[PDB]
Design a protein around this ligand. Structure first.
Ligand SMILES: Cc1cn([C@@H]2O[C@H](CO[Si](C)(C)C(C)(C)C)[C@@]3(OS(=O)(=O)C=C3N)[C@H]2O[Si](C)(C)C(C)(C)C)c(=O)[nH]c1=O
Lengths: 412, 553
């Protein structure tokens, strides 16, 4: 006797989501994968009486040579009524984001033993499609807790605790978090230390019964929200003052105090763009006080668990991407940049996907609730290829920008 | 010989609903005579059963001897029950496409409509299947019956029938990785690239396997001679084409009349290269009526001729061969239209297609090429499960310049340049830094929303200035006109300064064709310039010409 019944919200029915076309390579890979999952009772073939469906696809895991099955439960999770504590105080771990280092461990394959509630199982239906629709797709549903479902960790949570307390006692300082298939553990420990620190949890966990041999190390030292900086120059041309006046005007949206009157006054006139204009003292002071306000932080910038987190991304060129997270326009909760040379400098789509993952991971760690992305890319282009580079167990939500912001440069 | 049973699929009615109660029809004695004759055949076969009136439900029975064919056939109307029957997994989504089919040396057709008919129906659901045969003259109680099998016309029959057959065949398919078994409608298609003799064995074997569930299946689907009219196509032994298209020559073209003209030429395009559709289509966006005659932009009636010219020469596509590669070629048809051919060996197409520019104010050739490409990628994955190698009319250097500079993220899969004019190219490029020694034009526009009167003009560092009066204009058009004046009165190198975020946007998208012949004349000016630097500044800070040009009110 091992399952916990579960339902949906009032008027919320199972998912009926279209499977998208897959490559012959991925299908053959999902077939093989899925046969074995059947041999071990993990999932079973279902009849035509099950109408529901969730998309599924295949990937090559982080630092991997083997294919892996990925199921997009985004819709099923929005249909899942999260389970809650019975004492009102409910905390996300702020400490993890405050800790020096955060190591992510994939604890998904643990759920493969724990059974799923019968009256819910029909809801995890999915199809391996055929090529050119010649044959009817091959359908299954889960018998055990599925990777990708968020109501899945909530169940194993008051069970993992048991698996984690033999560590929490021992290392009272460390913080441990959980978002989906992964465990987030951070420590204010020396790297050599913190690193070896994980094998202790990575090992003591197998004793509890328990892929998991790869390395991804993560750190928070940065500015929460990178500060806006103005340039320092000895000679300023009309074009420089203009770009400056531009950047500042944009910043006064965020920092009310930004005045650019004396900086504007020199702009009066109709001089060649490339002409050097000498700075006055009236506008130096204007520039001085402006820099100060820029050093200091936005006032009353509160987070609020009731609204959603929005991540914006800008393609700056040469594999450089800036990005911002927020819930309120002009109220950045965090900024940053991904200028990495690990992804393709020959593939935009590939670079953006990576950008989105890293920004997602950063989000979970700071708030525990991934961001709603605004992509600098035509809808069709993104869905056609993003899956070909996804390496994570979860998937955020995302809209699409179609008009280039003027603010691109103002960030880098 | 004992037979394996065909387990039943649990069926349920919708959320909080109950069986149908539709009173029976008033029939002809003759029909009643028939229905009785028939239901008696069925009773013995087990297909149906007699029931007590204790069973609450009922579904109306119709009867029809059809089209000079003496045979009388029974026909239940489950329309109601259906509407109260749960949803099942859909067998419908998507249509296989000819260019995707993989031929085999040997192919046998087995009729399996009979097995279908032997598929047991869920017990707890049989109840809702009840139906009554009226008695002659109404002098006796009607005969009560409920199905024990999947009733023709019922909602869950095609799915469950297919599903049950998928299951029976599963083991066979496996134990014989060499052959292919397809399931379409009420037939099984068995193909194999095997020795003429061996194939017949494999059939005989299949037959033995299906007999384990007591099903006897004869090569019965009526033998027909190629080509086979399947879903709008002609499937010849080695080639496929669409069934003929013939278009209307009337002068009284109406919305349906044209709506119709679209559906057929588009269909024709998957195989016949170069069929334009824009023109005839253009006036249809601004309509809500489907019943009246329509004029013709000449550019619209000419194309009809082009299509017709293309359509008089038989054109066929091939079937798929997995070893050989997959290749797609794209060409610019002109005017936001494109065309492509997917093939394996040159001068032998699998299929062809077209892509028309999405509706937008302004656009450029590269963006469109890119879209056409994603479309072909998507289609190709659907049909062959892989992306083809692309042969595009665009230089590697142009593509490289474009994407590295484009503000969005964009991507074309493995592709190689093909020197076939018209080449797709970049028409102009804005400088990245101001231009030393080039005249700086501070431009500015404005319109009074009420009066609709504005001014568009500029002032320069060289002292050159100009303000032009306009009527019937917007606070956006004035801004673009101003930029246009600067482009007109400046030399080959020019620095332009606007405050128009709107203008910046349009031009920062680098379109090469627009709807505004205004934005379209600007593009033309841009083409002619050697170096154009476009800068932006904030309004009402009273800066430069926009300020000197701003005070001209
Ligand atoms: C409509 C149709 C199809 N087929 C064949 O069935 C299979 C598919 O069914 Si159909 C198209 C109904 C579906 C929708 C894919 C299930 C088929 O056999 S294969 O194993 O050699 C490979 C196939 N594709 C078809 O062969 Si061909 C038409 C390619 C032929 C020219 C005779 C060699 C017929 O023999 N007759 C038909 O009328």
């Amino acid at each position: 006797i091992e399952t916990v019944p579960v339902k949906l919200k009032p008027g919320m029915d199972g998912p009926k989501v279209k499977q998208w076309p897959l490559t012959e390579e991925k299908i053959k890979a999902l077939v093989e994968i899925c046969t074995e999952m059947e041999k071990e009772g993990k999932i079973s073939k279902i009849g035509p009486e099950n109408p529901y469906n969730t998309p599924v696809f295949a990937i090559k895991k982080k630092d991997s040579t083997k294919w892996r099955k990925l199921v997009d439960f985004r819709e099923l999770n929005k249909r899942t009524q999260d389970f809650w504590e019975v004492q009102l105080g409910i905390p996300h771990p702020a400490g993890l984001k405050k800790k020096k280092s955060v190591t992510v461990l994939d604890v998904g394959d643990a759920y493969f033993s724990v059974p799923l509630d019968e009256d819910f199982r029909k809801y995890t239906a999915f199809t391996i499609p055929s090529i050119n629709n010649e044959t009817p797709g091959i359908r299954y549903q889960y018998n055990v807790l599925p990777q990708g479902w968020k109501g899945s960790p909530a169940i194993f949570q008051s069970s993992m605790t048991k698996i984690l307390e033999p560590f929490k006692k021992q290392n009272p300082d460390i913080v441990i978090y959980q978002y989906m298939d992964d465990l987030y553990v951070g420590s204010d420990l020396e790297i050599g230390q913190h690193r070896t620190k994980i094998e202790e949890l990575r090992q003591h966990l197998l004793r509890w019964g328990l892929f998991l041999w790869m390395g991804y190390e993560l750190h928070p030292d940065k500015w929460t929200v990178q500060p806006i900086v103005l340039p320092e120059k000895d000679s300023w041309t009309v074009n420089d003052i203009q770009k400056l006046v531009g950047k500042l005007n944009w910043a006064s949206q965020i920092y009310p105090g930004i005045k650019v009157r004396q900086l504007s006054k020199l702009l009066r006139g109709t001089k060649a763009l490339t002409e050097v204009i000498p700075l006055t003292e009236e506008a130096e002071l204007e520039l001085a006080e402006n820099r100060e306000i820029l050093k200091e932080p936005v006032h009353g910038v509160y987070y609020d668990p009731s609204k959603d987190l929005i991540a914006e991304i800008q393609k700056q060129g040469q594999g450089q991407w800036t990005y911002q997270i927020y819930q309120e326009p002009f109220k950045n909760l965090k900024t940053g940049k991904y200028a990495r040379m690990r992804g393709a400098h020959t593939n935009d789509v590939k670079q953006l996907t990576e950008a989105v993952q890293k920004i997602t991971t950063e989000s979970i760690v700071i708030w525990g609730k991934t961001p709603k992305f605004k992509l600098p890319i035509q809808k069709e282009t993104w869905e056609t290829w993003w899956t070909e580079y996804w390496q994570a167990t979860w998937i955020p939500e995302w809209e699409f920008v179609n008009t280039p912001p003027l603010v691109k440069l103002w960030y880098q | 010989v004992p037979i394996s049973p065909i387990e039943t699929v649990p069926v349920k009615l919708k959320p909080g609903m109950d069986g149908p109660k539709v009173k029976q029809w008033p029939l002809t004695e003759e029909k009643i005579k028939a229905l009785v004759e028939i239901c008696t055949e069925m009773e013995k076969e087990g297909k149906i059963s007699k029931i007590g009136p204790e069973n609450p439900y009922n579904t109306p029975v119709f009867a029809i001897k059809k089209k000079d064919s003496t045979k009388w056939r029974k026909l239940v109307d489950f329309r109601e029950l259906n509407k109260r029957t749960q949803d099942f997994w859909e067998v419908q989504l998507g249509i296989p496409h000819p260019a995707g089919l993989k031929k085999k040396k040997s192919v046998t057709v087995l009729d399996v409509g009979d097995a279908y008919f032997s598929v047991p129906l869920d017990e707890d659901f049989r109840k809702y299947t009840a139906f009554t045969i009226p008695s002659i003259n109404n002098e006796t109680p009607g005969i009560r019956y409920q199905y024990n099998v999947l009733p023709q016309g019922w909602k869950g029959s095609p799915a469950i029938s297919q599903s049950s057959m998928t299951k029976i065949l599963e083991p066979f398919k496996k134990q014989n990785p060499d052959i292919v078994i397809y399931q379409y409608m009420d037939d099984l298609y068995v193909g194999s690239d095997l020795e003429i003799g061996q194939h017949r064995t494999k059939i005989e074997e299949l037959r033995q396997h299906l007999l384990r569930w007591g099903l006897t299946t004869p090569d019965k689907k009526h033998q027909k001679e190629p080509p086979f009219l399947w879903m709008g196509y002609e499937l010849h032994p080695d080639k496929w084409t669409v069934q003929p298209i013939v278009l209307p020559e009337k002068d009284s073209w109406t919305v349906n009349d044209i709506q119709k003209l679209v559906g057929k030429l588009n269909w024709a395009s998957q195989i016949y290269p170069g069929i334009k559709v824009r023109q005839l289509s253009k006036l249809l966006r601004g309509t809500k009526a489907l019943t009246e005659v329509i004029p013709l932009t000449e550019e619209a009636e000419l194309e009809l001729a082009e299509n017709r010219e293309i359509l008089k020469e038989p054109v066929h596509g091939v079937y798929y061969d997995p070893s050989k590669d997959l290749i797609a070629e794209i060409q610019k048809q002109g005017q936001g239209q494109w065309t492509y051919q997917i093939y394996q060996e040159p001068f032998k197409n699998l299929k062809t297609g077209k892509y028309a520019r999405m509706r937008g104010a302004h656009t450029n050739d590269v963006k469109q090429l890119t879209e056409a490409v994603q479309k072909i990628t998507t289609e190709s994955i659907v049909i062959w499960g892989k992306t083809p190698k692309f042969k595009l009319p665009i230089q590697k250097e142009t593509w490289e310049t474009w994407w590295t500079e484009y503000w969005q993220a964009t991507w074309i899969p493995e592709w190689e340049f093909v020197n076939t004019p018209p080449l797709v190219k970049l028409w102009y490029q804005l400088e990245k830094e101001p231009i030393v020694g080039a005249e700086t034009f501070y431009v500015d526009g404005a319109a009074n929303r009420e009066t609709k009167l504005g001014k568009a003009g500029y002032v320069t560092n060289k002292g050159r200035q100009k303000v032009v009066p306009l009527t019937n204009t917007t606070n956006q058009k004035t801004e673009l006109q101003a930029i246009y004046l600067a482009l007109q009165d400046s030399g080959l190198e020019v620095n332009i300064v606007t405050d128009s975020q709107y203008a910046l946007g349009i031009i920062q998208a680098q379109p090469d064709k627009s709807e505004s012949e205004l934005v379209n004349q600007i593009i033309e000016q841009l083409i002619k310039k050697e170096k154009v630097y476009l800068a932006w500044v904030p309004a009402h800070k009273g800066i430069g010409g926009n300020e000197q040009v701003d005070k001209l009110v």
